[PDB]
Design a protein around this ligand. Sequence first.
Ligand SMILES: N[C@H](Cc1ccccc1)C(=O)N1CCC[C@H]1C(=O)NCc1ccccn1
Ligand SMILES: *[C@@H]1O[C@H](CO)[C@@H](O)[C@H](O)[C@H]1NC(C)=O
Ligand code: NA
Ligand code: NA
Lengths: 28, 11, 251
Amino acid sequence: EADCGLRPLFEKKSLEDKTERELLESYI
Amino acid sequence: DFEEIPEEYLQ
Amino acid sequence: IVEGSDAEIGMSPWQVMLFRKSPQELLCGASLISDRWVLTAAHCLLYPPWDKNFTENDLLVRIGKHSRTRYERNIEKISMLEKIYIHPRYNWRENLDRDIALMKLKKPVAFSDYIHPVCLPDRETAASLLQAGYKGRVTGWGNLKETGQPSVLQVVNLPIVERPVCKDSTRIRITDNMFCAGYKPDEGKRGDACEGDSGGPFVMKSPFNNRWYQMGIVSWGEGCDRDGKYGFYTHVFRLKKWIQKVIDQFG
Ligand SMILES: N[C@H](Cc1ccccc1)C(=O)N1CCC[C@H]1C(=O)NCc1ccccn1
Ligand SMILES: *[C@@H]1O[C@H](CO)[C@@H](O)[C@H](O)[C@H]1NC(C)=O
Ligand code: NA
Ligand code: NA
């Protein structure tokens, strides 16, 4: 779907979950 | 263990 | 999930519970990929060595859940299965090669704050993100330890492991349709999937478009969270042509 992978309670509202930054930091 | 689910789903 | 934490509300809105009708029990994890299609591991549905061979009417899927055992009135949605599709070259005899299955829902599920599909990776996203050291996230209601069960959905972030390390950790023959993830003994941190997490998603958040992609399916391991062992995941991109063929033909 065009909207896949964008969470209503997070990405859609520009809120981050408590540990997603751990993933980002590993993407070097 | 598991709470019973509505009967409609077991029909 | 071993050594994970409680998920936040709506953290994994594509998470699906595969639920046995009688007796009522958790069978596996799974994921929502569209309003009509659910992705899981083939071994959640077919594994002859354990006398497992479920048909559509044996099962339900429960979508939008957080609590493991509660009936989450007004939040979760429960769907019947129209049809199960197992990869035609799923190798249940040897090593779980091509451990993938699709389930088509009898009726489309309504999306909500708690119910929303994950993306499947394109070749470029897969090539960019499926690299040793890069972390993904596994979620599930499976056991908290190898040898108990969580109140709510658990989450753990785990690094993808170098293929030679995966291979050298096990006597089982690994294939290109698998990857492994987890911390090494020296790394300090730990965590793993466990029984009941089977079939659930290993996801990564693309730093290019900020979308979540499902790169893996919880497939197999030896024990749970053992030092020097790693969890093995179905390589979703490598099998995407089959996924697409099923959806195009039967969607
Ligand atoms: N322990 C076996 C190892 C194995 C692997 C491949 C072929 C035969 C045996 C296993 O993981 N199995 C045997 C069949 C299903 C799978 C399993 O338990 N998967 C669920 C699982 C495993 C590890 C962690 C979380 N879930
Ligand atoms: C599993 O179930 C189907 C349908 O009942 C059956 O035809 C098949 O032979 C069984 N065993 C498999 C697919 O290995
Ligand atoms: Na080996
Ligand atoms: Na380990």
